[PDB]
Amino acid sequence: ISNIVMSSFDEEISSFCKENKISYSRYADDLTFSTNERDVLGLAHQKVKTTLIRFFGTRIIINNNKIVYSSKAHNRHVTGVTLTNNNKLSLGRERKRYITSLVFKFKEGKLSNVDINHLRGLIGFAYNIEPAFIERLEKKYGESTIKSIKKYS
DNA sequence: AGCCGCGGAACAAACTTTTTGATCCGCAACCTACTGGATTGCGGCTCAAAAAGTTTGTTCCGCAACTGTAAATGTAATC
Description:
part of a larger assembly, 1 chains, mainly alpha, three-stranded antiparallel β-sheet, two-stranded antiparallel ribbon, about 40% helix, DNA-binding
């Protein structure tokens, strides 16, 4: 129902974004606008504000507190996924090192069974965002290391 | 989505602390010796009167967490 209530808004905003070389996406309420041209996002913000108050009405409004700008100069994220300056999709250095530290500690056998499920979930999740990271772990630590958590007993 | 008591506020009559515009009264001046008229004039001191400065009793304004039959759910992450 949350999707059906916002269907014409999405179509019109996509049509507007197509003409200005702007990419559109939306997860429930996480509307992210991205572009390659410089100083065009103001027009996109004005358009989304004026179309959110015309079809769907004055019912919902733009949170004028969390409107955030970003570029390659600073950190850029789209729903948990970190976009690198080299045009790559990764989790982020902190998580990237946390997972590898945990999988390394697995080999030394100094980890309790509580966090074994933590590593199971984290390795399983590092297949839906970055399909590569586990391959890099295999390249560094080995297949024998990875194929012990995914089928842990 | 509704609106509890609490405490500032926006107003508005009363007190209350000075700004102003005369009036006065020593008080040295004349004038000549000295109360010189039958005089003025001049600067501190005081007077309510009233345009300014608080002080205090009343009236609305706003806002929070959750509501009456009602989910413990192996791991990670999204709105």
